Amino acid sequence: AAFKPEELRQALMPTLEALYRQDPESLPFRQPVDPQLLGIPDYFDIVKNPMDLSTIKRKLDTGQYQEPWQYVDDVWLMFNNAWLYNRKTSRVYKFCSKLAEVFEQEIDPVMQAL
């Protein structure tokens, strides 16, 4: 199957909106991690491929995902980065787990329908 770009964007966008609109759980994930402003110079040593919701949005809007699995892989990359870097009981980690629960519920019907 070849996906048309605007059709792929339209099918996947609601799932990205569901993540971004969680308050407060989306807040640590709406912008790229800035280790300088956060005072965490070790961050890029641990997280070699950063990802966040704003970057996923830009990629979804600009034809960077040719197949749905590429979008799904970036969402999981964002989650796995947070689960590697942060303590289990931290706010970031707990919020990440909430987003992952939302994403599982939203992505599965959409992937069924393609």
UniProtKB/Swiss-Prot annotation:
Disulfide bonds: none annotated. Acetylates histones, giving a specific tag for transcriptional activation. Mediates acetylation of histone H3 at 'Lys-18' and 'Lys-27' (H3K18ac and H3K27ac, respectively). Also acetylates non-histone proteins, like DDX21, FBL, IRF2, MAFG, NCOA3, POLR1E/PAF53 and FOXO1. Binds specifically to phosphorylated CREB and enhances its transcriptional activity toward cAMP-responsive genes. Acts as a coactivator of ALX1. Acts as a circadian transcriptional coactivator which enhances the activity of the circadian transcriptional activators: NPAS2-BMAL1 and CLOCK-BMAL1 heterodimers. The gene is CREBBP. Residues 42-88 are annotated as: Interaction with histone. It is found in: Cytoplasm; Nucleus. Found in a complex containing NCOA2; NCOA3; IKKA; IKKB and IKBKG. Probably part of a complex with HIF1A and EP300. Interacts with GATA1; the interaction results in acetylation and enhancement of transcriptional activity of GATA1. Interacts with MAF and ZCCHC12. Interacts with DAXX; the interaction is dependent on CBP sumoylation and results in suppression of the transcriptional activity via recruitment of HDAC2 to DAXX. Interacts with phosphorylated CREB1. Interacts with CITED4 (C-terminal region). Interacts (via the TAZ-type 1 domain) with HIF1A. Changing N80 to E/R: Abolishes interaction with ASF1A. The chain holds residues 1085 to 1196 of 2442 of the full protein. Residues 80-98 are annotated as: Interaction with ASF1A. Changing S97I: Impairs interaction with ASF1A. This is CREB-binding protein. It is linked to Chromosomal aberrations involving CREBBP may be a cause of acute myeloid leukemias. Translocation t(8;16)(p11;p13) with KAT6A; translocation t(11;16)(q23;p13.3) with KMT2A/MLL1; translocation t(10;16)(q22;p13) with KAT6B. KAT6A-CREBBP may induce leukemia by inhibiting RUNX1-mediated transcription. Methylation of the KIX domain by CARM1 blocks association with CREB. This results in the blockade of CREB signaling, and in activation of apoptotic response. Sumoylation negatively regulates transcriptional activity via the recruitment of DAAX. Residues 3-110 form the Bromo domain. Changing Y93C: In RSTS1; mild form; impairs binding to ASF1A and acetylated histone H3. The KIX domain mediates binding to HIV-1 Tat. Changing D34R: Impairs binding to acetylated histones.
